[PDB]
Design a protein around this ligand. Sequence first.
Ligand SMILES: CCCCCCCCCCCCCCCCCC(=O)O[C@H](COC(=O)CCCCCCCCCCCCCCC)COP(=O)(O)OCCN
Ligand SMILES: CCCCCCCCCCCCCCCCCC(=O)O[C@H](COC(=O)CCCCCCCCCCCCCCC)COP(=O)(O)OCCN
Ligand code: NA
Lengths: 270, 270
Amino acid sequence: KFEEFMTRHQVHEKEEFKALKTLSIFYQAGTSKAGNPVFYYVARRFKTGQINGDLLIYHVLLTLKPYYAKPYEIVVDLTHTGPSNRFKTDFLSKWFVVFPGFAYDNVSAVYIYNCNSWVREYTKYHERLLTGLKGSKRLVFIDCPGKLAEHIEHEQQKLPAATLALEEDLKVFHNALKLAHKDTKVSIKVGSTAVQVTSAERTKVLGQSVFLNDIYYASEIEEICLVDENQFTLTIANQGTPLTFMHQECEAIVQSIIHIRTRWELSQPD
Amino acid sequence: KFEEFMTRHQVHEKEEFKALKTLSIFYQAGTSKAGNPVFYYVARRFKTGQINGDLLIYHVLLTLKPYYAKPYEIVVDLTHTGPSNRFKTDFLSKWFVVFPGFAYDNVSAVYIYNCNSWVREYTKYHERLLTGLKGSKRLVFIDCPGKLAEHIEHEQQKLPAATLALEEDLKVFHNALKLAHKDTKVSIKVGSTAVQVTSAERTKVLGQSVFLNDIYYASEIEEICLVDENQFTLTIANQGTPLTFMHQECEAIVQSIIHIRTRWELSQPD
Ligand SMILES: CCCCCCCCCCCCCCCCCC(=O)O[C@H](COC(=O)CCCCCCCCCCCCCCC)COP(=O)(O)OCCN
Ligand SMILES: CCCCCCCCCCCCCCCCCC(=O)O[C@H](COC(=O)CCCCCCCCCCCCCCC)COP(=O)(O)OCCN
Ligand code: NA
């Protein structure tokens, strides 16, 4: 939309805008197996309050400008995406008008990576705006890290190194159950830096059945309570409501998590 | 001084004071080989400007009162102590008068742990108020971690866990040379979370020849740079002029430091 294009050009690229590039929130990297240019959006790298929306969306416009006249694909990294990264209602709706019609058409495929519970609720709450994304063949959720290789060569992939690191050396606990108004089978994976709870059964997101992956850095873990011989709880910072899980070896799970919370506290800024 | 005993009792400890115990800057722990109650002061734990000095002194005064009538010893952990942990002149002086005479005399010995370059400079800078400490034999510097056992049995030692963490799994580079106007024989030790530059030769601190242990967390390392095959740069956050080191294995050192810096970056907040 050149009307927004020029409104953003009456004052040329400032020095805050140029900072967006260095933080690698949206960038082009690699080519897909289909022979299309790939772009990456690292959701967790956007802070609602800290980052000016108009600059971001404009930074994306300049990035896609040269490419979006032809086929191209987007990889959306939803790793550890939470409230602090959300696009507020009014800002979210901008994305549907600021780009040319063909730019939207030329998107060959969108690859959703590490979709989580919060994002699901987000799409739930913004079900209106995202109806065009509902049951779309272009929308492709990555069940597990290994399936992305089906669309993009492993070497052509360029996810944030921090994202890939979350897939290394995990103590995995299968057959766990997440207790709530609605029970759900999950796997509880403990890493040196965080804890990941992956749904063992598919769930609905934007019309598709997918696997969610909730990530909690050790820094977010406040309270760790062992309730029973097969039940424990986690208190996540700024989340309020405690998470409850059931597992045969809750004693081993808690110890494992306490350890990573400790190793973290040790190496911290005094 | 019972004026501080009075002035502090007329208002008391309602709020913030109770938080001084939660961060444990000064605490009693263990018993020395001499047969005395040991107390610890974690210098890094105190943040000048954030914590009220009078409240701190009041804390220390209370956790000492039950004991300072009899002989006791103090272990001051100067690990990673810097400017943001300093005692302002007017606050420093308050320490020499607020306590009862006998309370001072009853300090059997003070064990200084991990004294660094900055503290030494702070000492030289505040020489006027620290003149009584110059030459004092009650001041016992700890050459190396093991030497502490000469005064406190291992099972009694209660140094902060974070301190002990810096002692294990270290890749050491001996016979290195720190390049300045005055060149200093130093050993460079790379831990999983920090780099330690330990002086191989002694310098003067409060009138005593001792070794220094400069500690730089992975989070403080902004710029590593290999100059020669045997010389490299080490830029620390908020210290300006970078450190310079000579060593036959500089390539190996730089590669090791870059590693722990990269690993740290892969674990940082969004
Ligand atoms: C806010 C929380 C965190 C971010 C994610 C929020 C959404 C939930 C998770 C799923 C994200 C899927 C977004 C995919 C966008 C790229 C391609 C696409 O799906 O198609 C078009 C979008 O193509 C674009 O140009 C998007 C450019 C990417 C920049 C930023 C990436 C993610 C930002 C959040 C959602 C934006 C979706 C686009 C809205 C038009 C939309 O056209 P339409 O179906 O609505 O038909 C009529 C159009 N008026
Ligand atoms: C007496 C003052 C104690 C605090 C000194 C702070 C300045 C930092 C110096 C650099 C490292 C060495 C630590 C100092 C050891 C303290 C022991 C000492 O010498 O005092 C004796 C006994 O000290 C105590 O009983 C103090 C009890 C609590 C100690 C907690 C304070 C430790 C501060 C360490 C970090 C400060 C600065 C960090 C960064 C700038 C009594 O001798 P005096 O008769 O000369 O004193 C009064 C004369 N009328
Ligand atoms: Na004794």
